[PDB]
From a paper:
To further improve the local resolution at the binding interface, we performed “block-based” local refinement and improved the local resolution up to 4.4 Å, allowing reliable tracing of the main chain at the interface. Only the heavy-chain of 1F was responsible for the antigen recognition and all the CDRs targeted the “core epitope” precisely. Since the resolution limited the analysis at the residue level, we predicted the spatially close residues and performed mutation experiments to validate their role on antigen binding. Results showed that mutations at R102 or D114 (CDR3) dismissed the binding ability, indicating the critical role of these residues for RBD binding. We further tested the binding ability of 1F to mutated RBD proteins, and only the core residue mutation, N487A, could weaken the binding affinity of 1F. Mutations at other positions, including the new worrying mutation, E484K, did not affect the binding affinity.
Here, by comprehensive structural analyses and extensive functional validation, we defined a core epitope avoiding viral escape. On the basis of this concept, we further identified an ultrapotent core epitope targeting antibody, 1F, which precisely binds to the core epitope and is tolerated to most of circulating mutations. More surprisingly, we found that the core residues, F456 and N487, were also involved in the binding of Class I–II antibodies. We hypothetically defined this region as a “core epitope” and supposed that binding residue mutations outside of this core might result in an immune escape without compromising the infectious of viruses since these mutations dismissed the binding ability of antibodies but not ACE2.
Residue numbers in the entry:
A (entry chain A): 336 to 514
B (entry chain C): 1 to 111
C (entry chain B): 1 to 132
Write the structure that this text describes.
């Protein structure tokens, strides 16, 4: 397979526009990667992470996105909070794995790297795995927007302010979720 | 009407509880947009003291509390301390004037 | 960490337009939802809201005073200017400019209350006297 195209990959998608890839019919070695000790988080819910590589599956879904360290606890099976309710929601029955590593040196940028966007407003929560397609403006306050983002009517969240000199709670992390 | 209405002064001796009332209308204190309180040493920049009816910015003693009901609100400072010698104003947004309307304000002296 | 500074002439003739400056630092008036406002305070009297701008060029003036109030911004210098037309000795007062960080208190209703309650950083203030 091309896990290196996922792990040794160049660009990562922002959480509002996470990246899904289907994977099947290829050769993968799992304990080399989970034990590569290159990631800050590699937590598997459902399947045992410990060498439960005795399988070959019909399909593999890979969802990639960007968060901050402080925010990792909200990116988890059956987790509650801003991102899940308003930005990207995962169902409680997540039979998969989540990997994430600090990519400050790779996702920061001088003057700040403002490439990652997040959805900050939504009327509802995300019905298992959708992405930033429609990015309109919604009245999130009293009356019609009719145009220019303004009073009681906005977009989603801004950029992440991933300056390279940030604290870790404020640092960029790349996340890849395998189902 | 255009001013929130407070009793023009409220006083007490050091350690007393001093409360300040704040009378508004339907459009501000009543059916309006929540009440904030400011603490401000006379002639100096004010400082937000209470936000969102009942939030405190860090640094305001827990002994300052706010309450609202209908078109009237009050701030209670329960145990006046030397730091409490200031002016105090209430404020709230009025939908009828579509303006953020201040209270008439109170100066404290620790007797 | 936020700084505002009002500058201007002490004596502005009645029935004219006064332009006062308010250089700031620590934030950009280009920041999403940020505001810059003007408030007046007559001698020994209360505070009076005058106006606010927006990095989107949206702006608000006291409805009763809109035609006589004017606010302008200069993102490049991070400054807010307050212009007052048809001034009168009645308009004599202390002027304050103030910074509004993004929208309202975003936490709490999701800022779903027009503007929470108010702003954050106040300037030192400038005394303006109107007389002919």
């Amino acid at each position: 397979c091309p896990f290196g195209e996922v792990f040794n990959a160049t660009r990562f998608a922002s959480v509002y526009a996470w990246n899904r890839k289907r994977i099947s019919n290829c050769v993968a070695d799992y304990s080399v990667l989970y034990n590569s000790a290159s990631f800050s988080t590699f937590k598997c819910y459902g399947v045992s992470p410990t060498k439960l590589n005795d399988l070959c599956f019909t399909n593999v879904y890979a969802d990639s996105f960007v968060i901050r360290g402080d925010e990792v606890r909200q990116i988890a099976p059956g987790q509650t909070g801003k991102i899940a309710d308003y930005n990207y929601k995962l169902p409680d029955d997540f039979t998969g794995c989540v990997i994430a590593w600090n990519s400050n040196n790779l996702d920061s940028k001088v003057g700040g790297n403002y490439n990652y966007l997040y959805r900050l407003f939504r009327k509802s929560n995300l019905k298992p795995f959708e992405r930033d397609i429609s990015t309109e403006i919604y009245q999130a306050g009293s009356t019609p927007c009719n145009g220019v983002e303004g009073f009681n009517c906005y977009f989603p969240l801004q950029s992440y302010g991933f300056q390279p000199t940030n604290g870790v709670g404020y640092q960029p992390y790349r996340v890849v979720v395998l189902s | 009407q255009s001013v929130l209405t407070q009793p023009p002064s409220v006083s007490g001796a050091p350690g007393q509880r001093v409360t300040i009332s704040c009378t508004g209308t339907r459009s501000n204190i009543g059916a309006g947009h929540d009440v904030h309180w400011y603490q401000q040493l006379p002639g100096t920049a004010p400082k937000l003291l209470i936000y969102g009816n009942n939030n405190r910015p860090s640094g305001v003693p827990d002994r300052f509390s706010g309450a609202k009901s209908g078109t009237s609100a009050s701030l209670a400072i329960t145990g006046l301390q030397a730091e409490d010698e200031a002016d105090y104003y209430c404020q709230s947004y009025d939908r009828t004037l579509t303006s953020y309307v201040f209270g008439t304000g109170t100066k404290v002296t620790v007797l | 960490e936020v700084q505002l500074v009002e500058s201007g002439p002490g004596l502005v003739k009645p029935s004219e337009t006064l332009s006062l400056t308010c250089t700031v630092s620590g934030g950009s008036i280009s920041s999403s939802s940020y505001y810059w406002g003007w408030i007046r305070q007559p001698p020994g009297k209360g505070l009076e809201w005058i106006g606010s701008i927006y990095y989107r060029g949206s702006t608000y003036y006291n409805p009763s005073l809109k035609s006589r109030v004017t606010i302008s911004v200069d993102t490049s210098k991070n400054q807010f200017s307050l212009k007052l037309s048809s001034v009168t000795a009645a308009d004599t007062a202390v002027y304050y400019c103030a910074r509004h960080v993004r929208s309202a208190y975003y936490y709490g209703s999701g800022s779903y209350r027009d503007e929470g309650n108010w702003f954050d950083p106040w300037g030192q203030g400038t005394l303006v006297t109107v007389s002919s």
